[PDB]
């Protein structure tokens, strides 16, 4: 017995927590990312990077804590603990926001390890690896949003902070500065996510309401056993119902479930392509025909032009606080505002 | 035998290609009316004075909009919650100016989708089904009623209802955030949990079923031809899928009963969308999202910002610029 | 007013959901198919095809 | 040299449901991207 | 409106090229 094959035996035992070869990448990296996030949201400030309190130690709550992005002065420095910024000082590393690339990098390598775990367990069990192919969507989202968006921007500062209200800030920032709702790549993402939620709800309700009477109890859940051969619900009845209700219906179970896979994964990939565009400020910010008309004609108003005005107001009122390294002094008279508010 | 009984048998027939039913006898006229008026208004309605301040907003394609910016603009703020049909207008042009098409489309659409939910029950009853598909459909219905009816009622004007367009929806959402802080509302958070988890679990279910398909085709043809419509037997190995998923996380996190799995798949996004419908319906009465602004002070008393304070700066910037010409007083009371 | 209106609107909605759940289950149980479709007498299997 | 028949030739199929799904996808992609093409 | 001069040709080709591809594939199916 070779030592590699003995180690392969030990790593792929049937235990409570499967390890595998992928676990050597997954578990230390996922533990580092999760412990870094919990450590930062419990103890670590954003006072020197953002001028903000973002830990439970400062009095923030679960909504208002974050592992915030590092200072804009560092650019896209990877901000290693031993790196030229922190210089080995753990306290300085915490204060300059090094927990953000710590969490983001270990998280990215843990996500790699998780899709590798999906591949490894799919190979061992003997099934096709479509769970890993489906998980390509979340990794596309993580790579485009937390990595390539700040890389395209000036620093890691403009990456989303690992927090609830920090993510809400990133979301509103992308509305006001990028017009990300107007981007068709995000619209395909929204369509994919709402379609995935629709398909989940409709598929579950259809199965639960086309169940076969396979038991004597009103509790229908005990009328199923996993080792049975026949279908637990009537695809014919479900097909007839949705054909007469909606006009069309699924007639193929395998196509139904591939579509349930396909819709949100494709939405995530499309929104990722849009975030890649936004990394370089390649926005769908404006419809130039409507601005040219609105500049020439003061009677022309659409909901698009109203959204443009909303974005301008948000940018001017948020940027001095959201980007304190820039020292944006906007006196009150230059702030755009409507009548009386 | 009777003419009425013959009509009742035709109406309730399961042999109709599209099921009508008694709910369909209300659904079909209302939905056809709303569809026809929406299409005509989206293409060719004149501009609508939504804020009631004689500042008409071009909503239709013939007046300079594209598909993204086009909308059926909500009725005038001067109307408020007043019932504004065609026969209450002195002319059709006045009706178009004051946003009557929005009221017509929205009222017939809301009746139609409530009758769609009733019809879903009706056909499940005629087909010998269990009846709770309409309960799952009640979550999008509640969300639609929240944004088209309940939010206007609580705000006191149908001008506050979501516009029937893409950029109009974005405008509704941005003004909603600036006024109610919906992102900080936990019901919206539950809705985001519902849609993110529903898409997650849709991807999971689909990926596990596609992963555990029984080999019934060659490598040339599509694997979907391994399933025959109306086959008795299972098209995929649930035990293999459970073995994979209980090794991917751990054994007791994986469903083995397909009925519990599908009840969970139904229940998660439906409950999430119910909660977010109630969140929008409760911010109709101005019960807003969490206000943590200036919640952290130092020992002197100076405000230490958090991410909620930056979010509030964004909300203020959205608020001071919204309906720029409609406000005359210092507070946006509704 | 805000608390009372919000609470009672949420309760009214969830009680409409209860009506739908119980009205449908009452009809299904009085009709005899609240526990699922009988395999031998599945009603759709005796209907003509839609097209 | 001789021109021999290739035995790796295989027919392509697209069923009617796939045709409808593709036509709807192409139509909605046109609907989505036409406003940005016009700008 | 002052639109892109190529917007009409891009929209028609973006719709019509894969429409043609799908129609070609559907009509030949069964051969």
């Amino acid at each position: 017995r070779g030592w590699f094959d003995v180690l392969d035996d030990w790593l792929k035992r049937d235990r409570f927590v499967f390890i595998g070869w992928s676990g050597l990448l997954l578990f230390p990296c996922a533990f580092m990312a999760l412990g870094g996030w919990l450590t930062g949201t419990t103890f670590v400030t954003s006072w020197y990077t953002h001028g903000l309190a973002s830990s439970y130690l400062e009095g923030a709550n679960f909504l208002t804590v974050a592992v915030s992005s590092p200072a804009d002065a560092f650019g896209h420095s990877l901000l290693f603990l031993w790196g030229p910024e922190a210089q080995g000082n753990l306290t300085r590393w915490f204060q300059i926001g090094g927990l953000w690339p710590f969490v983001a990098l270990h998280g990215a390598f843990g996500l790699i390890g998780f899709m590798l775990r999906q591949f490894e367990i799919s190979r061992l069990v003997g099934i096709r690896p479509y769970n890993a192919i489906a998980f390509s969507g979340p990794i596309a989202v993580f790579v485009s949003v937390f990595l390539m968006y700040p890389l395209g921007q000036s620093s890691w500062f403009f990456a989303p902070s690992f927090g609830v209200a920090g993510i809400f800030r990133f979301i509103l920032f992308l509305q006001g500065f990028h017009n990300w709702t107007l981007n068709p790549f995000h619209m395909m993402g929204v369509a994919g996510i709402l379609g995935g939620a629709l398909l989940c709800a409709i598929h579950g309700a259809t199965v639960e309401n086309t169940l076969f009477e396979d038991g004597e109890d009103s509790n229908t859940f005990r009328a199923f056993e996993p080792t049975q051969a026949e279908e637990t619900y009537s695809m014919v009845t479900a097909n007839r119902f949705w054909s007469q209700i909606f006009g069309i219906a699924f007639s193929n179970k395998r196509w139904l479930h591939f579509f349930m896979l396909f819709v949100p994964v494709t939405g995530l990939w499309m929104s990722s392509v849009g975030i890649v565009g936004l990394a370089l400020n390649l926005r769908a910010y404006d419809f130039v025909s409507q601005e040219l008309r609105a500049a020439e004609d003061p009677e022309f108003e659409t909901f698009y032009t109203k959204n443009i005005l909303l974005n301008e107001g948000m940018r001017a009122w948020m940027a001095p606080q959201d980007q304190p390294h820039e020292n944006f002094i906007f006196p009150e008279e230059v702030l755009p505002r409507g009548n009386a508010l | 035998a009777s003419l009425w009984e013959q009509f009742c048998q035709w109406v309730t027939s399961t042999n109709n290609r599209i099921y009508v039913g008694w709910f369909g006898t209300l659904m079909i006229p209302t939905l056809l009316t709303a569809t026809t008026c929406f299409i005509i208004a989206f293409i060719a309605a004149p501009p609508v004075d939504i804020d009631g301040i004689r500042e008409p907003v071009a909503g239709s394609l013939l007046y300079g909009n594209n598909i993204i910016s086009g909308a059926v603009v909500p009725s005038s703020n001067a109307i408020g919650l007043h019932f504004y049909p065609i026969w209450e207008a002195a002319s059709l042009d006045e009706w178009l100016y004051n946003g009557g098409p929005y009221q017509l489309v929205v009222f017939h659409f809301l009746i139609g989708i409530f009758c769609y939910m009733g019809r879903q029950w009706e056909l499940s009853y005629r087909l010998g089904m269990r009846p709770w598909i309409c309960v799952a459909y009640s979550a999008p219905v509640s969300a639609a009623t929240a944004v088209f009816l309940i939010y206007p009622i609580g705000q006191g004007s149908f001008s506050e209802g979501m516009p029937l367009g893409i950029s109009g929806t974005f405008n509704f959402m941005i003004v909603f955030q600036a006024e109610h802080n919906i992102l900080m509302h936990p019901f919206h958070m539950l809705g985001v949990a519902g849609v993110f988890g529903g898409s997650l679990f849709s991807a999971m279910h689909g990926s596990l079923v596609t992963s555990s398909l029984v080999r019934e085709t060659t490598e040339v043809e599509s694997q979907n031809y391994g399933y025959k419509f109306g086959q008795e037997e299972e098209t995929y190995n649930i035990v293999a899928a459970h073995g994979y998923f209980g090794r991917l996380i751990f054994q007791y996190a994986s469903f083995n009963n397909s009925r519990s799995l599908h009840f969970f798949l139904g229940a998660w996004p439906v409950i999430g969308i119910w909660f977010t419908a109630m969140g929008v319906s409760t911010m109709a009465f101005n019960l807003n999202g969490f206000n943590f602004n200036q919640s952290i002070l130092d020992s002197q008393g100076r405000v230490i910002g958090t991410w909620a304070d930056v979010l509030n700066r964004a909300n203020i910037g959205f608020e001071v610029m919204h309906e720029r010409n409609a406000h005359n007083f210092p507070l946006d009371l509704a | 007013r805000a608390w009372l209106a919000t609470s009672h609107f949420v309760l009214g909605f969830f009680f409409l959901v209860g009506h739908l759940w119980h009205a449908g289950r009452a009809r299904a149980a009085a009709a005899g198919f609240e526990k699922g479709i009988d395999r031998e007498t599945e009603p759709t299997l005796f209907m003509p095809d839609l097209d | 040299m001789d021109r021999n028949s290739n035995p790796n030739r295989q027919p392509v199929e697209l069923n009617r449901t796939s045709l409808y799904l593709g036509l709807l996808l192409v139509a909605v992609l046109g609907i989505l991207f036409s406003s940005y093409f016009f700008n | 409106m002052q639109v892109n001069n190529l917007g009409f040709i891009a929209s028609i080709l973006f719709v019509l090229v894969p429409t043609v591809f799908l129609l070609i594939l559907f009509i030949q199916t069964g051969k």
Binding site: - | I18, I67 | D49 | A27 | -
Partner: peptide, 30 residues
Amino acid sequence: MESVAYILVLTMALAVLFFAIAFREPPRIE
């Protein structure tokens, strides 16, 4: 003239919807 293009693409989607409902491949039990 962009309005013609928008009307055509919306009409193509609605025609696809009609032909997919009215002229679907019928689901057959076999």
